[PDB]
Amino acid sequence: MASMERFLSVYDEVQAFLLDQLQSKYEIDPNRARYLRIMMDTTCLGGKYFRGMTVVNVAEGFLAVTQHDEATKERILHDACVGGWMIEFLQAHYLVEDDIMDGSVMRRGKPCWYRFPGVTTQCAINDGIILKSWTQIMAWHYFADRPFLKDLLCLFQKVDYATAVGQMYDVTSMCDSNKLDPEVAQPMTTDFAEFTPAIYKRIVKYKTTFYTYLLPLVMGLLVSEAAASVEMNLVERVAHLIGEYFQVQDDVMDCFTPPEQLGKVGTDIEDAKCSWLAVTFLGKANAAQVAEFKANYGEKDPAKVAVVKRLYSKANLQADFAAYEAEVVREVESLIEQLKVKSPTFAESVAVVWEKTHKR
Amino acid sequence: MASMERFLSVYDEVQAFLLDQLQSKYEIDPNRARYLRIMMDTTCLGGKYFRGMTVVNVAEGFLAVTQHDEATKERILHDACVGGWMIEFLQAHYLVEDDIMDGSVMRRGKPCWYRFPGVTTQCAINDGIILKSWTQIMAWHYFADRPFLKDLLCLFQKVDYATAVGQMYDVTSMCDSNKLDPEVAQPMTTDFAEFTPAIYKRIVKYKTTFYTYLLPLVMGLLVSEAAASVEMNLVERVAHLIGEYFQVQDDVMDCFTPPEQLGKVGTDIEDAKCSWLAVTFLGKANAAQVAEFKANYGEKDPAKVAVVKRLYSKANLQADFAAYEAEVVREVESLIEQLKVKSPTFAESVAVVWEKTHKR
Ligand SMILES: COc1ccc(-c2cc[nH]n2)c(O)c1
Ligand SMILES: COc1ccc(-c2cc[nH]n2)c(O)c1
Ligand SMILES: COc1ccc(-c2cc[nH]n2)c(O)c1
Ligand SMILES: COc1ccc(-c2cc[nH]n2)c(O)c1
Ligand SMILES: [Zn+2]
Ligand SMILES: [Zn+2]
Ligand SMILES: [Zn+2]
Ligand SMILES: [Zn+2]
């Protein structure tokens, strides 16, 4: 079976399980089951599934070099798919709640979930809650007897928590730290002294890289019982490196990729986000360029946004991006080499992850 | 040590643990640690702690009849307190997100968390997320080596999930089921045919009773290694019965307890909630009374709200409440008797829970 066909079929299985359980144990009625089915589909489907399919791809790499009965190969692939869906549902949770938090308009060429007419924020917050609850239901049901259940749940929790910490770092990135205070409405920074590479790296590390790269990789290992074919410190280093890059790309596309192509109108400039573009601009700007950035950043006025975009283009950030990209390629190749020492197989999956990221 | 002194001290311990971990492992800075400390205090403290102290009280009952080294007694009490805080933080999660979902104004005589000037919804949704993530961090850290870790995590998950299902039943209780549809803005029901005792019971069972009564009771058992001193089906029956009652009280106070005393301006009438008062009114009203209810319920206009309140008073619902209360007392006494067969101790804790509920 091709991997994607298998992955999508398990989605239907998992869906039917969750909805059937709601009828047999939770007293749901058909109409609310239908609401949840449509919520699930709308929030979990339609992306490229690279998080969830990474779990599958890691597990397939190990299958090709490990002796197993056919039943065991099927069981391992089924587990990789369920694990993959846990990650996809965890992302769906994030995206639902983030969209509400940020007052987002579109996601993937469609309205954000909370903006559907029959949803509203009042339901959507709870819908996002359920999305994450379903990850746990999956794990407890499908992995009940599995030796990796404990490690998998613990890993999941830590990644989840890192992710929520990262959302806090992200939504607070345009405040001055010493001014954070729940009793006082938070002004945007005037100095941008916290728009640094180290601070940007901290935001992106927690908000994206743990769930997008570390979790799929380590889940692949756990469902394969292969965590001893790797030096976990290298797996973390390479996840954080590739994850940072992925985010830098995301940050550039927010500003420069056409809305029709991005699936949304990017608003990082208006939201005063600590983006790669802002940090890199401030790292090379002269005093006049910095003053014009401060007078125009974080404003809804389209004229000021166009002025920030012009400031980025004139500063030739595409060159800083190339240099960044070169250094990442260098370091990713290095870590892949270090990973070959203990597992060629896992190194190869990491190469594939890098290819999918670098060439998207 | 008195139970409450112990419980509150463990709060300080757990707080310091969580904040210290954020500095050592999550790269937090002092100011964001301070934000989280104040969030924690504001959202987790200030109630009566009957959920969390139930865990302690169950565990203390078992200590009085089970032989143990002094170190083991301290360890069991410490675990009961940590478990109790897991439940309190889980409630804090619910309350933060529910307040945002419902556009609530006050909670416990103070602004809802999201309404603090330096919070906003954008942070508060995530703050609520973290609150629940901290429950898991507690469990994995404090119960790492414990034999009950698995059962406790599994129990927690199921209760959490039941709770989120119950929030969906609650916020959808004024829609007609057959009209639920994420593509279509949801009209309030005109017939109120779904305002029935069985439907009300389903809402309250999931939204309140699993986390408020079932979880504290069963956690008390688990940290005591005493789950075989009870018939779990009786524990569930008695939790659901007492929990229903607790909610009925809550529903009556929303309408009739002065705002200064309730700690908020109750809005169940305006929100068209499926409350005990509405269901009981519709169960006894004549055709004219039902028509006047339909023309005035679920409206912000204070005149219509005063008309619904008058309709409840004239219908002598305090009498239906007494009869309900009598039947609950009867059934609770019966279940306590059935629980004595296997554990006098646990039966007594359940009597105390009932006393605290019935006499609040
Ligand atoms: C774990 O590896 C990956 C690899 C690539 C991507 C990707 C490419 C376009 N969107 N997402 C990902 O989310 C995870
Ligand atoms: C002015 O800033 C930029 C920076 C980077 C890029 C980029 C990177 C890969 N493709 N395009 C860009 O289009 C504009
Ligand atoms: C598990 O037992 C209880 C007993 C009583 C209460 C109560 C009384 C006033 N608020 N809450 C509770 O939340 C849980
Ligand atoms: C008109 O409806 C009611 C129903 C019940 C009560 C009640 C129950 C315990 N104390 N008070 C009430 O004050 C008004
Ligand atoms: Zn966001
Ligand atoms: Zn972005
Ligand atoms: Zn609510
Ligand atoms: Zn209420």
Keywords:
homodimer, mainly alpha, Farnesyl Diphosphate Synthase, 2 strands, transferase, SGC - Diamond I04-1 fragment screening, XChemExplorer, dimeric
For the report, how would you describe the main beta sheet of chain A? 2 strands, antiparallel
The class by helix and strand makeup of chain A works out as: mainly alpha
Strand order of the biggest β-sheet of chain A: 1-2
Q: What radius of gyration of chain A results from the CA coordinates?
A: 22 Å
Distance between the termini of chain A: 25 Å
Largest interface: A-B, 61 and 61 residues
Amount of helix of chain A: over 70%
**What small molecules does the structure contain?**
5-methoxy-2-(1~{H}-pyrazol-3-yl)phenol, zinc ion
Q: What is the H/E string of chain A?
A: HHHHEEHHHHHHHHHH
Shape of chain A: globular
- What is the CATH class name of chain A? Mainly Alpha
Seen as an oligomer or otherwise, the chain set is homodimer
CATH topology of chain A: Farnesyl Diphosphate Synthase
| CATH architecture title of chain A | Orthogonal Bundle
How much of the sequence lies in strands of chain A comes to under 5%
Number of domains of chain A: 1
* CATH evolutionary superfamily of chain A: Farnesyl Diphosphate Synthase
Strand segment count of chain A: 2
Helical region count of chain A?
14
Binding site for Zn(2+) 5 (chains A, B): 236
Binding site for Zn(2+) 4 (chains A, B): 102, 170
Organism (chains A, B): Trypanosoma cruzi
Binding site for Zn(2+) 3 (chains A, B): 102
